[PDB]
Amino acid sequence: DNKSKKSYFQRFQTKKRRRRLCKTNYRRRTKLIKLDQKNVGEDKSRLVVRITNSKVICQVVKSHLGGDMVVAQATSAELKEFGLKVGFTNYSAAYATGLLCARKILRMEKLDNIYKPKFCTDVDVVEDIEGEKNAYRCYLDIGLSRNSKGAKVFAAMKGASDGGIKIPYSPKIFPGYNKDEEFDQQKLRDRIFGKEVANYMQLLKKEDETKFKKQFSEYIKQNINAEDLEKMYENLFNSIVTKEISKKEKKDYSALKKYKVMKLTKEERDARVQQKLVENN
Amino acid sequence: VSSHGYRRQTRNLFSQAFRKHGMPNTSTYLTQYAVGEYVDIKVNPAIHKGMPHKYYHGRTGIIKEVNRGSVIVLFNRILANKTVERKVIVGIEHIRKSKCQDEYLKRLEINKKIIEEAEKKGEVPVLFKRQPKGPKPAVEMLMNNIIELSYDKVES
Amino acid sequence: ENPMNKIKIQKLCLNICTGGGEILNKASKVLEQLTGQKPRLSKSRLTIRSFGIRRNEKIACHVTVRGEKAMEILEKGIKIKEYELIDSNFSTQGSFGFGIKEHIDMGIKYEPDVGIFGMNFYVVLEKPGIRVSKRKRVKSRVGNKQRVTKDEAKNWFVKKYEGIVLG
RNA sequence: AGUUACGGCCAUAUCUACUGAAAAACACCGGAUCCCGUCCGAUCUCCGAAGUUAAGCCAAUAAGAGCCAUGCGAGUAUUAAGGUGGGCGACUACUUGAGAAAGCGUGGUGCUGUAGUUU
RNA sequence: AGAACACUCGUGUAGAGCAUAAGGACUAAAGAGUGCCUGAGUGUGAGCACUACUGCUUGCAUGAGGGGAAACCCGGGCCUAG
């Protein structure tokens, strides 16, 4: 019925572009970014965490009039520099990426030597050291992803905290929480260092060795075993904190402009129509 | 007879324009305000807190005080044949920065150069005033290419 | 042949309608046996005196099955209908439906206090990629290449079960 | 030069048919042991790479519908000031000024900011 | 099983709803469901409607306050009467 009459089209109002594309929630964005008129010089940084089929992305972003500015970035695909061979979208790889992201920031601001790392041994928020500069402050932006206990977005967030950035959070969201009992932190540590997957690998070899090969082929190719994971992850964390990856080079891929298609001229378009009439008669 | 509620007679006012319904854009929230700026009121019907009374719609005033999400603006009004100042509270969603000072500020930037040189070299500024458009200018014309005009159109 | 681009079952829908009291409990126990699920009771949209229905009163129960279990039930039912269907039973959308009058033909033992009920079967066919229209982020309408058409649904039925589609 | 993450102005960006696409991505895709959620691992959450460019996203095409601009309509319709102008009225001519819309013709069919990646 | 019973697939700028006049407002909601709470807190200022009464907007301080991962919001009823 609706689309049968011209007036439908003439009266229609389009949503904003990133809404048509289902990428942004405007009601959430406005609450997150809106300016406080009395706190002049406050310049809130969002920590943006997004998870793709391939990789984990952390970005630190400041919202300015005209467009958001990226302060710093880190990606799970870069951990290949420190010898990560497998599971680039794993719970551990989320945590590692948040850790990396934090360090890069505190180095630029030169806070790095004041606020030291701390590998997952409590659930308190980061606290300003007396007689020194204040901690760098951020708030979490989870986008369109759901909040639930043990979601991978919160792993990256704990990574950043352990790395030295101040984020307010409640422990309600982590594995090892209990409704009316103290926090069981060994369960949390367990997941960070990969116990959850070791326990699955061990099970399948008893159940079905065919299915095992199908499920874990990539691991087999690296000769990794369930026993090796803790050493792997301890090394990975230390190396992130210790080393720094080489700078990126700039290159003109300008010549790939050969591949871009170009629209027809008016002169062509007209002749084409003319020919179409003559082909029909 | 008519009534006297707070939103009397606002059927035309306080309605959205064609194909412009919905909440405000980000630019509204990221604009910073300061005391002494001139600001201009235009109510957004979708926001129900911090609305001013409809007399003030489309009027321009001066910022007196700045709070978390609202502003206090000074206005003048005639009541009982006397002038009265009024202090109006408005939320930041219903205001836009006024353009009314634009030309004057440009002129001040030019004056600010001259007024310094006027101490060094002259004694008093030339001050660069505006002047209204004068008489029609003189013209020298080549006088080829004449066009004749006539009441040829009979207009039945 | 080109992988992807091959038909599958995505859903089988089963429903029993029995307006009244303990009948719905008696019914629900049947669905709970035919499939390893607990079915969802559904309520009357309007109030209709003649049919004996108040509004917001429960009137029917249904269950939706997917995966391997769907294949067993469909084979079990098309036998009861003797592999015979009419050109009326297929849609413009690539789906088809039929009915059964007697639940005991699906094999379960009688138990004279439980009773005899009929059942509706409805089947929905698909090709990969349909997720593009159901996921939260970047939701979009599918291409005409990846729909299932009326002819294809008939061809699949004939091929898979050797049934006869009457004009 | 494209893409991708986060954006700005919110159809020159919409809607309907068709067609293309080096690389790296983006996806569809393969499972449910756990955390989490369903009448239903469809959606949501977690653990994965055997396949595939068919789809989406991106780009082209159409005397396409719709949107945006401009010319014309047109000094036309309406209107401020004025006179011992006219008319039984209804209303209307003139003098000094301000000045449209619909239709219809012609052209367009997103532009840009910060970072990452790919000859 | 009928004009009108339950279940599905595709389209769907609101053609629906929003207790109670009329107008305005609202679309990953302010509508329909589901979870938790009693902020329908406590002191004390400044203002808007021709402003006394009344109604609403907004400042600072506090609670062994609430909801939410958090940014945020809440001292009655989406706004204009009771």
PDB file of N, CA and C (backbone and C1' of nucleotides) in Angstrom, chain D residues 77-110:
ATOM      1  P     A D  77      -1.357  42.047 -12.322  1.00  0.00           P
ATOM      2  O5'   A D  77      -1.331  40.936 -11.157  1.00  0.00           O
ATOM      3  C5'   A D  77      -2.433  39.985 -11.070  1.00  0.00           C
ATOM      4  C4'   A D  77      -2.267  39.092  -9.866  1.00  0.00           C
ATOM      5  C3'   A D  77      -2.532  39.742  -8.508  1.00  0.00           C
ATOM      6  O3'   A D  77      -3.936  39.849  -8.227  1.00  0.00           O
ATOM      7  C1'   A D  77      -0.575  38.377  -8.414  1.00  0.00           C
ATOM      8  P     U D  78      -4.490  41.238  -7.631  1.00  0.00           P
ATOM      9  O5'   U D  78      -3.687  41.432  -6.260  1.00  0.00           O
ATOM     10  C5'   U D  78      -4.250  40.947  -5.008  1.00  0.00           C
ATOM     11  C4'   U D  78      -3.162  40.825  -3.964  1.00  0.00           C
ATOM     12  C3'   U D  78      -2.821  42.125  -3.236  1.00  0.00           C
ATOM     13  O3'   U D  78      -3.800  42.412  -2.221  1.00  0.00           O
ATOM     14  C1'   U D  78      -0.815  40.984  -3.868  1.00  0.00           C
ATOM     15  P     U D  79      -4.256  43.921  -1.867  1.00  0.00           P
ATOM     16  O5'   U D  79      -2.923  44.589  -1.280  1.00  0.00           O
ATOM     17  C5'   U D  79      -2.424  44.200   0.033  1.00  0.00           C
ATOM     18  C4'   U D  79      -1.069  44.842   0.232  1.00  0.00           C
ATOM     19  C3'   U D  79      -1.067  46.370   0.364  1.00  0.00           C
ATOM     20  O3'   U D  79      -1.233  46.772   1.724  1.00  0.00           O
ATOM     21  C1'   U D  79       0.647  45.645  -1.121  1.00  0.00           C
ATOM     22  P     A D  80      -1.808  48.239   2.069  1.00  0.00           P
ATOM     23  O5'   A D  80      -0.503  49.169   2.209  1.00  0.00           O
ATOM     24  C5'   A D  80       0.324  49.111   3.415  1.00  0.00           C
ATOM     25  C4'   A D  80       1.386  50.188   3.381  1.00  0.00           C
ATOM     26  C3'   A D  80       0.907  51.631   3.163  1.00  0.00           C
ATOM     27  O3'   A D  80       0.524  52.280   4.383  1.00  0.00           O
ATOM     28  C1'   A D  80       2.722  51.166   1.723  1.00  0.00           C
ATOM     29  P     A D  81      -0.838  53.139   4.449  1.00  0.00           P
ATOM     30  O5'   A D  81      -0.406  54.501   3.721  1.00  0.00           O
ATOM     31  C5'   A D  81       0.616  55.345   4.343  1.00  0.00           C
ATOM     32  C4'   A D  81       1.228  56.291   3.333  1.00  0.00           C
ATOM     33  C3'   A D  81       0.274  57.265   2.631  1.00  0.00           C
ATOM     34  O3'   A D  81      -0.151  58.357   3.454  1.00  0.00           O
ATOM     35  C1'   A D  81       1.787  56.345   1.060  1.00  0.00           C
ATOM     36  P     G D  82      -1.711  58.769   3.411  1.00  0.00           P
ATOM     37  O5'   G D  82      -1.886  59.532   2.009  1.00  0.00           O
ATOM     38  C5'   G D  82      -1.206  60.793   1.801  1.00  0.00           C
ATOM     39  C4'   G D  82      -1.362  61.199   0.359  1.00  0.00           C
ATOM     40  C3'   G D  82      -2.788  61.472  -0.112  1.00  0.00           C
ATOM     41  O3'   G D  82      -3.161  62.782   0.319  1.00  0.00           O
ATOM     42  C1'   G D  82      -1.525  60.272  -1.779  1.00  0.00           C
ATOM     43  P     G D  83      -4.688  63.073   0.737  1.00  0.00           P
ATOM     44  O5'   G D  83      -5.345  63.579  -0.634  1.00  0.00           O
ATOM     45  C5'   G D  83      -5.056  64.916  -1.129  1.00  0.00           C
ATOM     46  C4'   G D  83      -5.594  65.005  -2.534  1.00  0.00           C
ATOM     47  C3'   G D  83      -7.099  64.737  -2.673  1.00  0.00           C
ATOM     48  O3'   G D  83      -7.984  65.855  -2.407  1.00  0.00           O
ATOM     49  C1'   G D  83      -5.872  63.451  -4.274  1.00  0.00           C
ATOM     50  P     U D  84      -9.048  65.839  -1.184  1.00  0.00           P
ATOM     51  O5'   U D  84     -10.470  66.076  -1.872  1.00  0.00           O
ATOM     52  C5'   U D  84     -10.952  65.112  -2.814  1.00  0.00           C
ATOM     53  C4'   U D  84     -11.760  65.837  -3.856  1.00  0.00           C
ATOM     54  C3'   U D  84     -10.962  66.795  -4.748  1.00  0.00           C
ATOM     55  O3'   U D  84     -11.401  66.573  -6.084  1.00  0.00           O
ATOM     56  C1'   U D  84     -12.813  67.919  -3.794  1.00  0.00           C
ATOM     57  P     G D  85     -10.272  66.075  -7.112  1.00  0.00           P
ATOM     58  O5'   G D  85     -10.046  64.528  -6.709  1.00  0.00           O
ATOM     59  C5'   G D  85     -11.109  63.529  -6.900  1.00  0.00           C
ATOM     60  C4'   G D  85     -10.857  62.660  -8.114  1.00  0.00           C
ATOM     61  C3'   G D  85     -12.030  61.785  -8.551  1.00  0.00           C
ATOM     62  O3'   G D  85     -13.005  62.549  -9.264  1.00  0.00           O
ATOM     63  C1'   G D  85     -10.008  60.539  -8.675  1.00  0.00           C
ATOM     64  P     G D  86     -14.574  62.277  -8.995  1.00  0.00           P
ATOM     65  O5'   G D  86     -14.866  60.857  -9.661  1.00  0.00           O
ATOM     66  C5'   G D  86     -14.856  60.778 -11.089  1.00  0.00           C
ATOM     67  C4'   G D  86     -14.946  59.321 -11.444  1.00  0.00           C
ATOM     68  C3'   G D  86     -16.212  58.575 -11.017  1.00  0.00           C
ATOM     69  O3'   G D  86     -17.278  58.923 -11.894  1.00  0.00           O
ATOM     70  C1'   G D  86     -14.313  57.236 -10.645  1.00  0.00           C
ATOM     71  P     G D  87     -18.788  58.974 -11.339  1.00  0.00           P
ATOM     72  O5'   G D  87     -19.062  57.503 -10.734  1.00  0.00           O
ATOM     73  C5'   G D  87     -19.504  56.411 -11.613  1.00  0.00           C
ATOM     74  C4'   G D  87     -19.593  55.107 -10.850  1.00  0.00           C
ATOM     75  C3'   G D  87     -20.652  54.987  -9.759  1.00  0.00           C
ATOM     76  O3'   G D  87     -21.965  54.873 -10.312  1.00  0.00           O
ATOM     77  C1'   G D  87     -18.644  53.914  -9.077  1.00  0.00           C
ATOM     78  P     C D  88     -23.057  56.013  -9.991  1.00  0.00           P
ATOM     79  O5'   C D  88     -23.850  55.450  -8.711  1.00  0.00           O
ATOM     80  C5'   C D  88     -23.861  56.190  -7.469  1.00  0.00           C
ATOM     81  C4'   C D  88     -24.650  55.431  -6.424  1.00  0.00           C
ATOM     82  C3'   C D  88     -23.863  54.407  -5.594  1.00  0.00           C
ATOM     83  O3'   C D  88     -23.280  54.989  -4.428  1.00  0.00           O
ATOM     84  C1'   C D  88     -25.881  53.414  -6.392  1.00  0.00           C
ATOM     85  P     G D  89     -21.785  54.569  -3.986  1.00  0.00           P
ATOM     86  O5'   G D  89     -21.701  52.961  -4.102  1.00  0.00           O
ATOM     87  C5'   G D  89     -21.309  52.179  -2.932  1.00  0.00           C
ATOM     88  C4'   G D  89     -22.113  50.900  -2.889  1.00  0.00           C
ATOM     89  C3'   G D  89     -21.321  49.582  -2.955  1.00  0.00           C
ATOM     90  O3'   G D  89     -21.053  49.072  -1.636  1.00  0.00           O
ATOM     91  C1'   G D  89     -23.025  49.614  -4.636  1.00  0.00           C
ATOM     92  P     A D  90     -19.544  48.651  -1.254  1.00  0.00           P
ATOM     93  O5'   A D  90     -19.265  47.250  -2.001  1.00  0.00           O
ATOM     94  C5'   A D  90     -20.095  46.068  -1.776  1.00  0.00           C
ATOM     95  C4'   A D  90     -19.903  45.091  -2.918  1.00  0.00           C
ATOM     96  C3'   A D  90     -18.463  44.820  -3.389  1.00  0.00           C
ATOM     97  O3'   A D  90     -17.759  43.769  -2.740  1.00  0.00           O
ATOM     98  C1'   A D  90     -19.848  45.276  -5.268  1.00  0.00           C
ATOM     99  P     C D  91     -16.323  44.028  -2.055  1.00  0.00           P
ATOM    100  O5'   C D  91     -15.452  44.953  -3.043  1.00  0.00           O
ATOM    101  C5'   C D  91     -14.579  44.361  -4.053  1.00  0.00           C
ATOM    102  C4'   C D  91     -14.734  45.117  -5.360  1.00  0.00           C
ATOM    103  C3'   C D  91     -13.472  45.741  -5.977  1.00  0.00           C
ATOM    104  O3'   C D  91     -12.731  44.872  -6.840  1.00  0.00           O
ATOM    105  C1'   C D  91     -15.290  47.267  -6.117  1.00  0.00           C
ATOM    106  P     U D  92     -11.131  45.033  -6.862  1.00  0.00           P
ATOM    107  O5'   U D  92     -10.866  46.250  -7.867  1.00  0.00           O
ATOM    108  C5'   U D  92     -11.165  46.107  -9.281  1.00  0.00           C
ATOM    109  C4'   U D  92     -11.255  47.485  -9.899  1.00  0.00           C
ATOM    110  C3'   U D  92      -9.932  48.248 -10.022  1.00  0.00           C
ATOM    111  O3'   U D  92      -9.210  47.720 -11.131  1.00  0.00           O
ATOM    112  C1'   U D  92     -11.654  49.691  -9.256  1.00  0.00           C
ATOM    113  P     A D  93      -7.716  48.278 -11.328  1.00  0.00           P
ATOM    114  O5'   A D  93      -7.961  49.682 -12.072  1.00  0.00           O
ATOM    115  C5'   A D  93      -7.429  49.915 -13.399  1.00  0.00           C
ATOM    116  C4'   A D  93      -7.541  51.379 -13.734  1.00  0.00           C
ATOM    117  C3'   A D  93      -6.277  52.208 -13.517  1.00  0.00           C
ATOM    118  O3'   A D  93      -5.388  52.062 -14.618  1.00  0.00           O
ATOM    119  C1'   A D  93      -8.112  53.371 -12.627  1.00  0.00           C
ATOM    120  P     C D  94      -3.843  51.969 -14.187  1.00  0.00           P
ATOM    121  O5'   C D  94      -3.408  53.453 -13.777  1.00  0.00           O
ATOM    122  C5'   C D  94      -3.491  54.508 -14.748  1.00  0.00           C
ATOM    123  C4'   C D  94      -3.406  55.819 -14.007  1.00  0.00           C
ATOM    124  C3'   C D  94      -2.076  56.125 -13.303  1.00  0.00           C
ATOM    125  O3'   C D  94      -1.067  56.680 -14.149  1.00  0.00           O
ATOM    126  C1'   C D  94      -3.899  56.641 -11.876  1.00  0.00           C
ATOM    127  P     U D  95       0.449  56.191 -13.893  1.00  0.00           P
ATOM    128  O5'   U D  95       0.981  57.109 -12.695  1.00  0.00           O
ATOM    129  C5'   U D  95       1.171  58.523 -12.930  1.00  0.00           C
ATOM    130  C4'   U D  95       1.510  59.196 -11.622  1.00  0.00           C
ATOM    131  C3'   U D  95       2.764  58.685 -10.902  1.00  0.00           C
ATOM    132  O3'   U D  95       3.940  59.279 -11.461  1.00  0.00           O
ATOM    133  C1'   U D  95       0.979  58.966  -9.356  1.00  0.00           C
ATOM    134  P     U D  96       5.320  58.452 -11.403  1.00  0.00           P
ATOM    135  O5'   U D  96       5.662  58.371  -9.830  1.00  0.00           O
ATOM    136  C5'   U D  96       6.669  59.260  -9.247  1.00  0.00           C
ATOM    137  C4'   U D  96       6.962  58.935  -7.789  1.00  0.00           C
ATOM    138  C3'   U D  96       7.758  57.659  -7.496  1.00  0.00           C
ATOM    139  O3'   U D  96       9.162  57.831  -7.701  1.00  0.00           O
ATOM    140  C1'   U D  96       5.939  57.853  -5.965  1.00  0.00           C
ATOM    141  P     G D  97      10.053  56.544  -8.102  1.00  0.00           P
ATOM    142  O5'   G D  97      10.172  55.744  -6.705  1.00  0.00           O
ATOM    143  C5'   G D  97       9.765  54.348  -6.609  1.00  0.00           C
ATOM    144  C4'   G D  97       9.572  53.971  -5.161  1.00  0.00           C
ATOM    145  C3'   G D  97       9.792  52.484  -4.853  1.00  0.00           C
ATOM    146  O3'   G D  97      11.168  52.070  -4.732  1.00  0.00           O
ATOM    147  C1'   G D  97       7.734  53.175  -3.888  1.00  0.00           C
ATOM    148  P     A D  98      11.605  50.589  -5.217  1.00  0.00           P
ATOM    149  O5'   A D  98      10.889  49.580  -4.193  1.00  0.00           O
ATOM    150  C5'   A D  98      11.511  49.190  -2.921  1.00  0.00           C
ATOM    151  C4'   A D  98      10.601  48.231  -2.177  1.00  0.00           C
ATOM    152  C3'   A D  98      10.578  46.797  -2.715  1.00  0.00           C
ATOM    153  O3'   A D  98      11.708  46.004  -2.333  1.00  0.00           O
ATOM    154  C1'   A D  98       8.345  47.530  -2.286  1.00  0.00           C
ATOM    155  P     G D  99      12.256  44.874  -3.351  1.00  0.00           P
ATOM    156  O5'   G D  99      10.988  43.949  -3.710  1.00  0.00           O
ATOM    157  C5'   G D  99      10.648  42.789  -2.888  1.00  0.00           C
ATOM    158  C4'   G D  99       9.353  42.202  -3.397  1.00  0.00           C
ATOM    159  C3'   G D  99       9.439  41.377  -4.676  1.00  0.00           C
ATOM    160  O3'   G D  99       9.933  40.059  -4.423  1.00  0.00           O
ATOM    161  C1'   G D  99       7.594  42.814  -4.834  1.00  0.00           C
ATOM    162  P     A D 100      10.818  39.379  -5.584  1.00  0.00           P
ATOM    163  O5'   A D 100      10.204  37.899  -5.673  1.00  0.00           O
ATOM    164  C5'   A D 100       8.864  37.715  -6.182  1.00  0.00           C
ATOM    165  C4'   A D 100       8.046  36.985  -5.142  1.00  0.00           C
ATOM    166  C3'   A D 100       7.839  35.484  -5.378  1.00  0.00           C
ATOM    167  O3'   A D 100       8.980  34.750  -4.882  1.00  0.00           O
ATOM    168  C1'   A D 100       5.739  36.526  -4.952  1.00  0.00           C
ATOM    169  P     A D 101       9.137  33.169  -5.188  1.00  0.00           P
ATOM    170  O5'   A D 101       7.810  32.582  -4.497  1.00  0.00           O
ATOM    171  C5'   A D 101       7.595  31.152  -4.410  1.00  0.00           C
ATOM    172  C4'   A D 101       6.123  30.835  -4.358  1.00  0.00           C
ATOM    173  C3'   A D 101       5.708  29.751  -5.351  1.00  0.00           C
ATOM    174  O3'   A D 101       5.926  28.445  -4.816  1.00  0.00           O
ATOM    175  C1'   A D 101       4.297  31.586  -5.617  1.00  0.00           C
ATOM    176  P     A D 102       6.948  27.502  -5.633  1.00  0.00           P
ATOM    177  O5'   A D 102       5.956  26.536  -6.445  1.00  0.00           O
ATOM    178  C5'   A D 102       4.940  25.779  -5.723  1.00  0.00           C
ATOM    179  C4'   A D 102       3.714  25.613  -6.590  1.00  0.00           C
ATOM    180  C3'   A D 102       3.909  24.842  -7.899  1.00  0.00           C
ATOM    181  O3'   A D 102       3.816  23.420  -7.757  1.00  0.00           O
ATOM    182  C1'   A D 102       2.730  26.846  -8.322  1.00  0.00           C
ATOM    183  P     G D 103       4.886  22.449  -8.478  1.00  0.00           P
ATOM    184  O5'   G D 103       4.661  22.704 -10.056  1.00  0.00           O
ATOM    185  C5'   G D 103       3.625  21.967 -10.801  1.00  0.00           C
ATOM    186  C4'   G D 103       3.243  22.713 -12.062  1.00  0.00           C
ATOM    187  C3'   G D 103       4.180  22.561 -13.272  1.00  0.00           C
ATOM    188  O3'   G D 103       3.936  21.421 -14.110  1.00  0.00           O
ATOM    189  C1'   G D 103       3.711  24.849 -12.928  1.00  0.00           C
ATOM    190  P     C D 104       5.119  20.333 -14.282  1.00  0.00           P
ATOM    191  O5'   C D 104       5.601  20.463 -15.817  1.00  0.00           O
ATOM    192  C5'   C D 104       4.954  21.398 -16.718  1.00  0.00           C
ATOM    193  C4'   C D 104       5.946  22.385 -17.295  1.00  0.00           C
ATOM    194  C3'   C D 104       7.379  21.909 -17.562  1.00  0.00           C
ATOM    195  O3'   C D 104       7.454  21.032 -18.696  1.00  0.00           O
ATOM    196  C1'   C D 104       7.373  24.153 -16.765  1.00  0.00           C
ATOM    197  P     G D 105       8.889  20.366 -19.017  1.00  0.00           P
ATOM    198  O5'   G D 105       9.598  21.504 -19.909  1.00  0.00           O
ATOM    199  C5'   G D 105      10.882  21.213 -20.528  1.00  0.00           C
ATOM    200  C4'   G D 105      11.804  22.408 -20.479  1.00  0.00           C
ATOM    201  C3'   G D 105      13.264  22.079 -20.167  1.00  0.00           C
ATOM    202  O3'   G D 105      13.919  21.515 -21.302  1.00  0.00           O
ATOM    203  C1'   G D 105      12.620  23.980 -18.952  1.00  0.00           C
ATOM    204  P     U D 106      14.654  20.101 -21.057  1.00  0.00           P
ATOM    205  O5'   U D 106      16.068  20.533 -20.416  1.00  0.00           O
ATOM    206  C5'   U D 106      16.879  21.489 -21.140  1.00  0.00           C
ATOM    207  C4'   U D 106      17.834  22.199 -20.217  1.00  0.00           C
ATOM    208  C3'   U D 106      18.779  21.301 -19.412  1.00  0.00           C
ATOM    209  O3'   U D 106      19.835  20.745 -20.203  1.00  0.00           O
ATOM    210  C1'   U D 106      17.949  23.027 -18.033  1.00  0.00           C
ATOM    211  P     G D 107      20.215  19.205 -19.901  1.00  0.00           P
ATOM    212  O5'   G D 107      20.956  19.298 -18.475  1.00  0.00           O
ATOM    213  C5'   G D 107      22.397  19.486 -18.452  1.00  0.00           C
ATOM    214  C4'   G D 107      22.809  20.162 -17.170  1.00  0.00           C
ATOM    215  C3'   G D 107      23.245  19.224 -16.043  1.00  0.00           C
ATOM    216  O3'   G D 107      24.575  18.750 -16.278  1.00  0.00           O
ATOM    217  C1'   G D 107      21.864  20.933 -15.181  1.00  0.00           C
ATOM    218  P     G D 108      24.904  17.180 -16.094  1.00  0.00           P
ATOM    219  O5'   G D 108      25.629  17.204 -14.650  1.00  0.00           O
ATOM    220  C5'   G D 108      24.994  16.519 -13.544  1.00  0.00           C
ATOM    221  C4'   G D 108      25.245  17.200 -12.220  1.00  0.00           C
ATOM    222  C3'   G D 108      25.164  16.211 -11.054  1.00  0.00           C
ATOM    223  O3'   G D 108      26.466  15.781 -10.655  1.00  0.00           O
ATOM    224  C1'   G D 108      23.522  17.904 -10.757  1.00  0.00           C
ATOM    225  P     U D 109      26.874  14.268 -11.021  1.00  0.00           P
ATOM    226  O5'   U D 109      26.702  13.455  -9.648  1.00  0.00           O
ATOM    227  C5'   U D 109      26.694  14.168  -8.392  1.00  0.00           C
ATOM    228  C4'   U D 109      25.603  13.605  -7.512  1.00  0.00           C
ATOM    229  C3'   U D 109      25.524  12.069  -7.397  1.00  0.00           C
ATOM    230  O3'   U D 109      25.694  11.536  -6.064  1.00  0.00           O
ATOM    231  C1'   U D 109      23.370  13.054  -7.720  1.00  0.00           C
ATOM    232  P     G D 110      26.474  10.132  -5.880  1.00  0.00           P
ATOM    233  O5'   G D 110      27.741  10.521  -4.971  1.00  0.00           O
ATOM    234  C5'   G D 110      27.572  10.698  -3.556  1.00  0.00           C
ATOM    235  C4'   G D 110      27.686  12.170  -3.246  1.00  0.00           C
ATOM    236  C3'   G D 110      29.051  12.666  -2.755  1.00  0.00           C
ATOM    237  O3'   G D 110      29.949  13.063  -3.805  1.00  0.00           O
ATOM    238  C1'   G D 110      27.305  13.450  -1.306  1.00  0.00           C
TER     239        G D 110
END
